[PDB]
Chain A
Amino acid sequence: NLCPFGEVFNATRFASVYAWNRKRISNCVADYSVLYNSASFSTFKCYGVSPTKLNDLCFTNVYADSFVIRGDEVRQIAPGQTGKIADYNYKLPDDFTGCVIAWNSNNLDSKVGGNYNYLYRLFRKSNLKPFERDISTEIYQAGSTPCNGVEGFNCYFPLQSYGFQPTNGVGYQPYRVVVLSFELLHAPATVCGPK
Chain B
Amino acid sequence: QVQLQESGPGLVKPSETLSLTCTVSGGSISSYHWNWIRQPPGKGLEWIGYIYYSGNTNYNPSLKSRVSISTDTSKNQFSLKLSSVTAADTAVYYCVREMRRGYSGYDYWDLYAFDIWGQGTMVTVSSASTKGPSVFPLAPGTAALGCLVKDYFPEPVTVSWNSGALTSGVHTFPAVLQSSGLYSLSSVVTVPSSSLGTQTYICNVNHKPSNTKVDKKVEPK
Seen from chain A, the residues whose Cβ lies within 8 Å of a Cβ on chain B are: 36, 41-47, 49-52, 71-72, 74-75, 78, 99-100, 102
Secondary structure of the B contact surface, majority rule = loop
Q: How far is the CA of A52 from the CA of B103 in the complex (A)?
A: 12
Secondary structure of the A contact surface, majority rule = mixed
Q: How far is the CA of A8 from the CA of B105 in the complex (A)?
A: 20
Q: Are B105 and A36 in contact (CB under 8 A)?
A: yes
Q: Are A99 and B105 in contact (CB under 8 A)?
A: yes
Using a Cβ–Cβ cut-off of 8 Å, how many residues does chain B contribute to the interface with A? 11
A-B contact count (CB 8 A): 47
Closest A residue to B55 by beta carbon equals A39
Contact of A42 among B101, B102, B103, B107 (CB under 8 A): B107
Residue picked from B101, B103, B108, B109, most chain A C-beta under 10 Å: B109
Tell me which residues across on chain B come within 8 A of A42, comparing CB atoms.
Answer: 107-109
Contact of A71 among B54, B102, B109, B110 (CB under 8 A): B109
Q: Are B103 and A74 in contact (CB under 8 A)?
A: no
Q: Are A46 and B109 in contact (CB under 8 A)?
A: no
Q: How far is the CA of A113 from the CA of B102 in the complex (A)?
A: 40
Q: How far is the CA of A41 from the CA of B103 in the complex (A)?
A: 16
Q: Are B106 and A43 in contact (CB under 8 A)?
A: yes
- State the Cβ distance, A54 to closest chain B Cβ, in Å: 9
Q: Are B103 and A46 in contact (CB under 8 A)?
A: yes
Closest B residue to A53 by beta carbon equals B104
Contact with A along B118-145 (1 / 0, CB 8 A): 0000000000000000000000000000
Q: How far is the CA of A51 from the CA of B107 in the complex (A)?
A: 13
Return 19 A-B CB contacts under 8 Å, by A number.
Answer: A36-B54, A42-B108, A42-B109, A43-B109, A43-B110, A44-B107, A45-B101, A45-B105, A45-B107, A45-B110, A46-B104, A46-B105, A47-B103, A50-B104, A71-B109, A74-B109, A75-B107, A78-B103, A100-B107
